[PDB]
């Protein structure tokens, strides 16, 4: 099933994934298209951070859903 990942940079990308996929794999896939590595990525769906352990079905992510990606740049 196809999903969308919207980034703050005014860009959207699309991914081929299965509901069995870990958030780790989704991140890995983003890396393949963008370059950004899994450990610099935060993913957000329905106002909640997706967690490295769980899978797409655990979060109830459907066909044609949009995920949101922010970077780890928190600093003081």
């Amino acid at each position: 099933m196809q999903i969308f990942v919207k980034t703050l940079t005014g860009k959207t990308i699309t991914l081929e994934v299965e509901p069995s996929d870990t958030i780790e794999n989704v991140k890995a896939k983003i890396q393949d298209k963008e370059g950004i590595p899994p450990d610099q990525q935060r993913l957000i769906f329905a106002g909640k951070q997706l967690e490295d352990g769980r899978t797409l079905s655990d979060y109830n992510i459907q066909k044609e859903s949009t995920l949101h990606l922010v970077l780890r740049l928190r600093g003081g």
Binding site: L8, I44, G47, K48, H68, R74
Partner: peptide
């Protein structure tokens, strides 16, 4: 893009408007 279920206004007032609060992406 905001998380922990905050609204834009909620995020702003808690995170951006006060002093001494770290900046995120």
């Amino acid at each position: 893009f905001i998380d922990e279920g905050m609204t834009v206004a909620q995020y702003c007032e808690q995170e951006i408007e006060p002093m001494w609060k770290d900046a995120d992406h």
